[PDB]
Amino acid sequence: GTVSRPRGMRPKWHKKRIKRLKLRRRRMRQRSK
Amino acid sequence: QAQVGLIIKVLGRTGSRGNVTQVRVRLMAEAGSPDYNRTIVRNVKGPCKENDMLSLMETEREARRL
Amino acid sequence: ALGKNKRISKGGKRGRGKAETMARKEWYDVVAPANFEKRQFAKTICNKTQGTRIAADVLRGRVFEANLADLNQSAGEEEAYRKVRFTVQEVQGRNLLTQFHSMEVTTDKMASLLRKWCTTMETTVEVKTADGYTMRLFVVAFTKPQANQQSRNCYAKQRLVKWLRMRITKMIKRRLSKVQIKEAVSLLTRNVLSDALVRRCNPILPLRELRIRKVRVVRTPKFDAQALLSAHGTIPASVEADQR
């Protein structure tokens, strides 16, 4: 334990989850374009 | 088959539960023998005191200090 | 562990007469060059000449390792910390005539020479002797504090370390190039070349100790039987083949 309370999942894994969400959103717009 | 050893001094109760005692013993052999006046450290099960005798039946091993 | 082998042979089943291994062995003597007083150090075994496998072809080229204190059988403890290797060049009956291979300081001695707050300086010198032997010298030196010194370290300036290296390289190349292999080995096992280095390199930098930590022969001339006989002088007789 080096950090304080995250009030959520690990920020690195939330950032990765957001990272994959942006990938799938730009693939859904590509197929409509 | 067995060699008698005389407990020279008690080195303290060994391990958890304190049922094993670390002792220093002197091998009781005739004068001029290879085992004469030689000393080893041994683990003893049971109540032991100074000037107590044990039949070691194997004098090559030495107990790890503790 | 005992009784844990699942696949003994990779082919199956068990194929011997319980032949004894040492019944086929023959005992030999390893003879050092004439600059060591204990000439017949070490004993070895080898198979008898059976068929076309001549025992002298497998004995040649073997490298035998011995302590310098045991070979020179005298002098102080400074040579109890050095080990010398000899390569077998010829088989004279039951004698193994050898030639100098390498010398090295034992691992305990070298590891104990290291102190923290000084500088450790290493020099590798490659020279060729008069008879065509190429050697690598591997000198090591350490700085020391002066008696007056109150400082917390005795590190050296890098230009004094480079000066120490170039002087050591000059003296070693100047000396060992003119001499033959037998004289070169005498200079190394008798510490005469070592003391010349410390005497001339201490004016450059205060040195706790300067020693040659490993000599190895890296290139050898073509075999000369007369040169091997000259290097061994009077070869002591071997009683290994004699009847008992």
Binding site: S4 | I40, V41, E62 | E77, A80, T106, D108, A111, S112, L114, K116
Partner: protein, 104 residues
């Protein structure tokens, strides 16, 4: 949270250098910086007192005049590996600042 050590646990001031190459821990192989690792140079006897006596009794070369060889290792530990092996322990806040410059 709060800064535990002005050292930050390593022997690297702010403007001394940027990067110190890591070493493999002696025990588990964890890559830790060379100035941060807990380094101990040990000199160990190859045999204990009783075992040395038996071997030196059978040795023509070893005895009172000639000592037996020792083992010289520079051991560098990860912080987790040094605390678990008890070569180093947690200290009171006041006692944390005291340093030893020589082996005691």
């Amino acid at each position: 949270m709060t800064t535990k050590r002005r050292n930050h646990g390593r022997s690297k001031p702010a403007h001394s250098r940027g990067r110190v190459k890591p070493i493999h821990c002696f025990n588990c192989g964890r890559l830790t910086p060379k100035d941060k690792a807990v380094g101990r140079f040990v000199v160990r006897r190859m045999l204990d007192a009783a075992s040395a006596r038996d071997v030196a009794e059978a040795s023509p070369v070893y005895g009172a005049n000639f000592p037996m060889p020792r083992l010289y290792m520079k051991q560098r530990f990860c912080i987790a590996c040094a605390i678990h092996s008890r070569t180093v322990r947690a200290r009171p806040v006041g006692n944390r600042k005291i340093r030893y410059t020589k082996k005691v």
